[PDB]
Design a protein around this ligand. Structure first.
Ligand code: UDP
Length: 365
């Protein structure tokens, strides 16, 4: 019983860290290649045929049309989520000076647009922040890296400033050494996916093992949105760092929580393997984090937390590498250059001449 489990996890770890190769030959990643595999596989379905003017106008129904013309940025007057457009635009604007013309259909909704099961209508290309193997959407660094992530009490203008968040969590990480972190699984968040229930129910059944509560979101409808319990408070990102075992679940799509959880130097438990942001591909299970299949049971949880509470040296090794990765390969520099290479390889696919369009508004610079 306990030993069978004990080994299985150990083989999986031994196997994983034996198999691991760094995302780049040197830590500085001068050529911006760490996540180059993702943009590669993402554009691929267009390599043979290219992007037609037709495909573009068709795909325009799937998001916010950006257009770079003669090194000037143009965008649909109406952006669905104004603050999200501002997050992306912080990134597009400095590149526009050195980019050729292109048309972009950028989806600022949480959920991807181009279902591969449908055909022809959903060929693309459309840019989204999060997808699964189901979707043809091209992945980009989300708006929240600069501004427009979830608005909360602690982040009234919506969570952002990754440059600032990094310095902040880094301090808090150094201040709270591993041994001083509480040996409890931690979570605080809203019921954006029922994959989160089992941890919350377990917490109510065993608070000494799991401290996990549902918060309230702006889409709250009834008591069901917190499994009939009183809405807990938002707890800050720095305050996560006092617990050893931090859980990350998908929401509508992938959650912004993940990247922040690593910089606590706590052990990140990532549930589900479906939903991605661009950098995830290089986040390797058992190396950087503990993997958990979607819809985990209360018993899965006890066994896995019990295992790591009983293998403290091993836990710490993982927390450390997980921290180092986000630290070394998710700097603002990594974000801007992914943006850069992505658009550069994308423009090459276009089989048509980008013409200006009057209904579009001038964005900058
Ligand atoms: O107590 C909390 C609850 C949420 N968040 C952050 O606010 C965002 C929204 O999280 P929520 O669970 O509400 O939705 P998600 O985006 O995770 O599906 C995420 O980036 C969380 O990391 C936080 O820092 N503290």
């Amino acid at each position: 019983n306990e030993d069978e489990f004990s080994f299985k996890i150990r083989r999986q770890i031994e196997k994983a860290n034996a198999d691991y190769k760094p995302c780049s030959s040197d830590p500085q990643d001068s050529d911006c290649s760490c996540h180059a595999n993702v943009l590669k596989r993402d554009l691929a379905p267009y390599k043979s045929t290219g992007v037609t003017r037709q495909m573009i106008e068709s795909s325009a129904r799937y998001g916010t049309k950006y257009k770079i013309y003669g090194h000037r940025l143009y965008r649909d007057a109406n952006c669905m989520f104004p603050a999200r457009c501002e997050g992306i635009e912080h990134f597009l604007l400095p590149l526009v000076a050195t980019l050729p013309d292109m048309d972009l259909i950028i989806n600022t909704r949480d959920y991807p647009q181009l279902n591969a099961a449908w055909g022809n209508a959903a060929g693309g290309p459309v840019f989204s922040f999060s997808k699964t193997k189901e979707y043809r959407d091209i992945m980009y660094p989300a708006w929240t890296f600069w501004a427009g992530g979830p608005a909360t009490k602690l982040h009234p203008r919506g969570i952002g400033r990754w440059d600032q968040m990094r310095e902040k969590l880094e301090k808090r990480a150094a201040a709270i050494p591993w041994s001083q972190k509480r040996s409890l699984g931690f979570f605080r968040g809203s019921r954006t996916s029922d994959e989160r229930d089992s941890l919350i129910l377990l917490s109510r059944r065993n608070p000494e093992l799991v401290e996990a509560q549902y918060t309230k979101n702006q889409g709250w409808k009834s008591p069901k949105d917190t499994l009939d319990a009183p809405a807990a408070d938002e707890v800050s990102f720095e305050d996560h760092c006092k617990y050893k075992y931090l859980f990350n679940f998908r929401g509508v799509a992938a959650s912004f929580r993940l990247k922040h959880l690593f910089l606590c130097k706590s052990l990140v438990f990532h549930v589900g393997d479906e939903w991605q942001e661009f950098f995830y591909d290089q986040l390797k299970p058992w190396v950087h984090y503990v993997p958990l299949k979607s819809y985990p049971s209360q018993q899965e949880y006890e066994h896995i937390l019990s295992f790591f509470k009983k293998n403290d040296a091993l836990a710490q090794e993982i927390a450390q590498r997980g921290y180092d990765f986000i630290w070394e390969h998710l700097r603002m520099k990594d974000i801007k250059c992914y943006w850069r290479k992505l658009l550069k390889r994308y423009v090459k696919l276009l089989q048509y001449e980008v013409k200006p369009e009057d209904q579009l508004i001038y964005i900058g610079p």
